[PDB]
Amino acid sequence: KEIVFGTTVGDFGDMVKEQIQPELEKKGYTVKLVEFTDYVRPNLALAEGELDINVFQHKPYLDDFKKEHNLDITEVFQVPTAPLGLYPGKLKSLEEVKDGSTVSAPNDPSNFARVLVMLDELGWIKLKDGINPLTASKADIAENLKNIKIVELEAAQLPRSRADVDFAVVNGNYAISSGMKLTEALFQEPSFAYVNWSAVKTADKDSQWLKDVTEAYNSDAFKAYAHKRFEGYKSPAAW
Ligand code: MET
Question: How is the protein disposed in the membrane (predicted)?
Answer without folding.
Answer: Lipid-anchor
